[model samples]
Target: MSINIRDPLIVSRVVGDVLDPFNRSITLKVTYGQREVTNGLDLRPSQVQNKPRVEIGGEDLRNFYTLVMVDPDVPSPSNPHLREYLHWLVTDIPATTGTTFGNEIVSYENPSPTAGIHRVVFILFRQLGRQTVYAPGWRQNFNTREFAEIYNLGLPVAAVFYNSQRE
Candidate 1:
């Protein structure tokens, strides 16, 4: 079975909601413990924190990157008021290193979905020079696309996601 982000993951209305498919194809290795974040897989809230170990591949170490994590199912998948709640943001990550190697604008927080299954998305943006992202004053209803435009991060070099909920 293959999932390419639809229905249960239909562009997430929060990520692919208003925007067209602008995701660039690149390898973004995201893992929580031994389980890597695949297209809508399980990653119980208890297993995520401090951001996942991410490995990015590119032709140049000269290329810098940014990583952001969001939960589309803020309160519950059915009654999501705070859509795209930002959980973490890291900028200036050099190629080939995990999230820790960059400047963490927003501290990583574990997924704590309280309702039905939730989708946690990790978006990777190719930075233009070294990026200086300021943390959002809030996480609720954070807009991933707007943030990308503000920093001129451009279309994401890659993105990966997984699912989780209260255990």
Candidate 2:
């Protein structure tokens, strides 16, 4: 079934948050403890610590992948000047495998939205190969578009988003 316009992904602007819409979709599943991350689902800050397992599908095993986790709302959504804060990044993953099998470039930072609801997005990019990937020095001021361009990630092959706020 086609996603509804009112779907949380669109309402939250996640459909257009980082990358534009695409026809090919790769499967991405993220969970925090017992709760599975569905678009727009609410997750409490305390409930988001443990590194959630990630399983990706589609594409060939010969190709590599890059996974990006970002918080569009940094500090607070109402006055989000820190917009698009990178939470985590992993790359050089073989297709159909989990993130742990790849290299953790930025390491995962659990969502901790102190003031307002935050939208945490997980975007997957098919990589050219196992190239040298660098980690960002600081956590503040991260641009997903720029990262994609610098790394030649192109457009995302798969993406998923979830909402979270201080509990």
**Best prediction by TM-score:** 2
Backbone clash count, each prediction separately: 1, 0
Off by over 4 Å in 1: 1-15
Give the best candidate by lDDT.
Answer: 2
Expressed as tens digits, the lDDT of each residue in 11-118 for candidate 1 is 555346423455566678987778787877887777885467888777778878888888877788788788878888888888877677888888888888778888
Give all TM-scores, in the order shown. Answer: 0.86, 0.91
Candidate 2 lDDT, tens digit per residue, 44-74?
8778887788888976778888998999888
The alpha-carbon deviation from the true structure for residue 105 of candidate 2, after best TM-score superposition, in angstroms, is 1.0
RMSD of each: 3.3, 2.3
Provide the lowest-lDDT 10-residue window in model 2.
15-24
